[PDB]
């Protein structure tokens, strides 16, 4: 869905999507806003 805008979902060729958080400088695979 629409992310908090700190992180962007990029697709790695291994077949996994990862969020690069430019604000917290941290990686997390899946959409955290879909958590609720």
């Amino acid at each position: 869905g629409p992310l908090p805008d700190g992180w962007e979902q990029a697709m790695t060729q291994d077949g996994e999507i990862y969020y690069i958080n430019h604000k917290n400088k941290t990686t997390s695979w899946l959409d955290p806003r879909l958590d609720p």
């Binding site: 990029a10 790695t12 060729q13 291994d14 996994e16 990862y18 969020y19 690069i20 958080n21 430019h22 400088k25 941290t26 990686t27 997390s28 695979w29």
Partner: peptide
């Protein structure tokens, strides 16, 4: 797996 370092994008 732990997500790759945000420093750069994995090409694999």
């Amino acid at each position: 797996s732990p997500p790759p370092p945000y420093s750069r994008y994995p090409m694999d």
